[PDB]
């Protein structure tokens, strides 16, 4: 029961204090990473280098190509809908790429391909291969395949096929008429491909009403994830629901009723797109364990089947270490405590090396109150003021005495000098708080806000 | 094939790039910001490589202060790295070169090796930058991609830069060799492979001219007493500290002379002058043909010690082949084009639009629309339809078809299906929204299409 948290997948909007309490309390299989820590790379390394030191994850992220893209690091693809008008040879070498990226920073799944088939009722637009479902399924088995060479896990999405529906998930639970016959001959063609393949995948659910076929959402559908997906299918892989939270579902079951219909139907992983969720759908889950709606047999296995698939990651890529380098080269002074609390007033060089400059604001602002924001000439120095604590970030103090004057001439009792280009000027600073970064980068910068909170007082 | 002796800096990609590259077949490919930041023409300069031979492709991403690809995490820097456990200098160029090699670079110009004096420097201790330096050789070759160290012989006791004069180190051999030297003779000695780039300045106290352009410096000391057996880089020839103090043929000379194989040139329009004047040096005998063919004998090992599968232009023949079209009236092409425009990630796509098509038209006027009117109506000598959301009623649809059909093409751009609501006009499907896609579209209008 130390083990519970191996039937959750949380998304990450942030990385903070609260994310790594929950995670280490909990100890979540899974982790998806969202544009909010994705856009401001110094968190994303943060983040990564703080996976490494807490246990074995499944590292993932939503980047399909095309209109879904969130990792910068992956160069852009015209997408599925594009790829499946070419012959198939090129989505899986774009997988490849893609995923040996991806692999290189740290993650080992990816939530793509998408094998819901584009039909004239749907628009999701681009982000299938076609309408034919033979195009869908010889480019959705080229993509996990490409996937996998690259060394990242693929997850198909979302099993049984909802290209069919006019209607959004995130908005209401949308409904597709077809019979099981056209399900299986069509929809789930691409789906049948892959597990009669030798690839390792997961399946992600459809928050998807099915009616000719059963009342439920496929996601929290005995029939169709035990007696279609399970038996039928034949497929013993990992089962991922899409977000819990989305309105599909939310609006229509509780989470007691969600978590209950997800895990007796045969699913393994509950998806929360919110990490701080995890406490209310963890607590639910194990209370439907103890009062025995849930059988404790479905729970083994689910945790059986995430182990398989944690023990395969083995990877030695974690673009984490470029948040230890910056940590480690930080050299501070001693601080006191009692300042820290205070409202900062913030000096920063005028303004790649200006990019930088424009960015350290933001980064403060995440460990300090901040009253003001002056740029100053670096040519000139800091024209004289006063705060309660004041963060001087130095950029050539030595250029000549009238500058070097601006900056000492700051109240040496309550000033903090970040020296963050050329650390020979920390000589010219004594008696006096000093930081050096070696580095003007975001995450650097960050770095020294953290060690000047934690370990430099 | 003396292609095989330079190496070319590109800030573009255009036909004279194609017309440069297919005509003297330079072995050695420098890609600049000028085409990086523009993600549609990397993807399509790739793809134009993958078919034209071999090459040797590099960028000047360091990390730190000197960065180029967006597609590498961001790196505090040597300064730091400096700082730091070597093996983590080892375990971020890995990873950077292994992500450079999946796009398809073959080469890095790093690690920099220079010591510093009073953030691209490792240090001060020469010691320090040794072991920083192999390290990053090592990690760069384990990640895919062959590392080049410079400046040799190290330039970190000048403040002078060599974009603006020729800079001065005083330093005497005996203090080179100690120092500046020492991490360069540490990787020579550990056999890493590596390639070297000299650097244009003086010493003063050991010889008249710059290193790049000096026989001493190369031959005595790299060559002889260091005994690097490997690729030797100039810096880039129309570099000042060359530039304004010796011709294009002295430099040529020289440097080929003094044991260089491979010039850089930062500028691939510069080729011909420089081909035609080392062609020039070899048929009057003011170059050895010896040195040129064992140049030529080095850069052939390079070329094939360098592989891959891995090639990003794969992308760009996606959006090539992705595109449908109807026929075109190739005279309507070279009119000057009204752009139509969806309004504003499917939007930052759109904004993209104008810059793609003022490479391939003249662009009159750029209006955009509201995709949940349609265009109002427009004249001109040639229109733009970039369609999105054409069916959502009819008077939408009648928008977009009220536009004049003897000169207006329609590019449909999200929804493929609306294409049959433009029966007998002039449609281009792009199945995609995405520059490379836009792109390539312009291509085949311009091209196959016509
Ligand atoms: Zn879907
Ligand atoms: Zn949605
Ligand atoms: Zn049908
Ligand atoms: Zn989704
Ligand atoms: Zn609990
Ligand atoms: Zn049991
Ligand atoms: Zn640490
Ligand atoms: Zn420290
Ligand atoms: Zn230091
Ligand atoms: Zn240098
Ligand atoms: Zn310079
Ligand atoms: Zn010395
Ligand atoms: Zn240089
Ligand atoms: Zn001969
Ligand atoms: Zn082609
Ligand atoms: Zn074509
Ligand atoms: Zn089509």
């Given at each position: 029961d130390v083990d519970l948290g191996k039937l959750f997948f949380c998304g990450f909007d942030d990385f903070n204090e609260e994310a790594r309490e929950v995670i280490q309390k909990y100890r979540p299989a899974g982790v998806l990473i969202y544009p909010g820590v994705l856009s401001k790379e110094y968190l994303f390394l943060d983040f990564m280098n703080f996976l490494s030191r807490n246990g074995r994850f499944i590292v993932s992220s939503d980047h399909e190509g095309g209109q879904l893209e969130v990792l910068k690091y992956v160069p852009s693809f015209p997408g599925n809908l594009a790829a499946?008008?070419?012959?198939?040879?090129?989505?899986?070498?774009?997988?490849?790429?893609?995923?040996?990226?991806?692999?290189?920073?740290?993650?080992?799944?990816?939530?793509?391909?998408?094998?819901?088939?584009?039909?004239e009722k749907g628009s999701v637009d681009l982000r299938?291969?076609?309408?034919?479902?033979?195009?869908?399924?010889?480019?959705?088995?080229?993509?996990?395949?490409?996937?996998?060479?690259?060394?990242?896990?693929?997850?198909?999405?979302?099993?049984?096929?909802?290209?069919?529906?006019?209607?959004?998930?995130?908005?209401?639970?949308?409904?597709?008429?077809?019979?099981?016959?056209?399900?299986?001959?069509?929809?789930?063609?691409?789906?049948?491909?892959?597990?009669?393949?030798?690839?390792?995948?997961?399946?992600?659910?459809?928050?998807?009403k099915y009616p000719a076929?059963?009342?439920?959402?496929?996601?929290?559908?005995?029939?169709?994830?035990?007696?279609?997906?399970?038996?039928?299918?034949?497929?013993?892989?990992?089962?991922?629901?899409?977000?819990?939270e989305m309105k599909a579902i939310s609006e229509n079951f509780s989470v007691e009723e969600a978590v209950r219909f997800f895990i007796e139907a045969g699913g393994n992983m509950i998806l929360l797109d919110n990490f701080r969720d995890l406490p209310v759908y963890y607590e639910s889950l194990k209370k439907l364990i103890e009062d025995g709606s849930i059988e404790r047999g479905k729970v083994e296995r689910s945790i059986k089947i995430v182990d398989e698939y944690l023990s395969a990651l083995e990877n030695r890529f974690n673009s984490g270490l470029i948040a230890e380098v910056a940590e480690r080269a930080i050299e501070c002074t001693r601080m006191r405590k009692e300042l820290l609390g205070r409202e900062v007033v913030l000096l920063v060089p005028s303004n790649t090396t200006g990019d930088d400059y424009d960015l350290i604001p933001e980064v403060a602002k995440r460990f300090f109150k901040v009253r003001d924001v002056i740029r100053?000439?670096?040519?000139?120095?800091?024209?004289?003021?006063?705060?309660?604590?004041?963060?001087?970030?130095?950029?050539?103090?030595?250029?000549?005495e009238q500058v070097l004057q601006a900056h000492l001439s700051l109240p040496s009792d309550r000033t903090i000098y970040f020296i963050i280009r050329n650390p020979f000027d920390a000589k010219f600073f004594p008696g006096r708080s000093v930081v050096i970064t070696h580095s003007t980068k975001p995450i650097s910068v960050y770095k020294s806000f953290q060690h000047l909170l934690g370990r430099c007082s």
């Open positions: 499946g008008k070419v012959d198939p040879v090129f989505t899986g070498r774009y997988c490849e790429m893609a995923g040996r990226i991806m692999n290189t920073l740290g993650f080992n799944m990816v939530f793509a391909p998408v094998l819901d088939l584009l039909s299938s291969f076609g309408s034919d479902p033979e195009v869908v399924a010889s480019h959705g088995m080229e993509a996990c395949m490409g996937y996998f060479k690259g060394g990242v896990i693929p997850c198909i999405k979302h099993f049984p096929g909802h290209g069919k529906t006019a209607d959004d998930s995130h908005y209401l639970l949308p409904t597709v008429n077809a019979s099981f016959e056209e399900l299986w001959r069509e929809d789930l063609l691409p789906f049948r491909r892959i597990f009669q393949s030798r690839v390792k995948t997961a399946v992600m659910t459809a928050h998807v076929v059963d009342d439920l959402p496929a996601t929290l559908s005995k029939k169709l994830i035990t007696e279609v997906l399970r038996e039928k299918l034949n497929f013993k892989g990992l089962v991922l629901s899409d977000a819990m100053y000439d670096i040519e000139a120095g800091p024209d004289d003021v006063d705060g309660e604590l004041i963060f001087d970030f130095v950029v050539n103090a030595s250029k000549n």
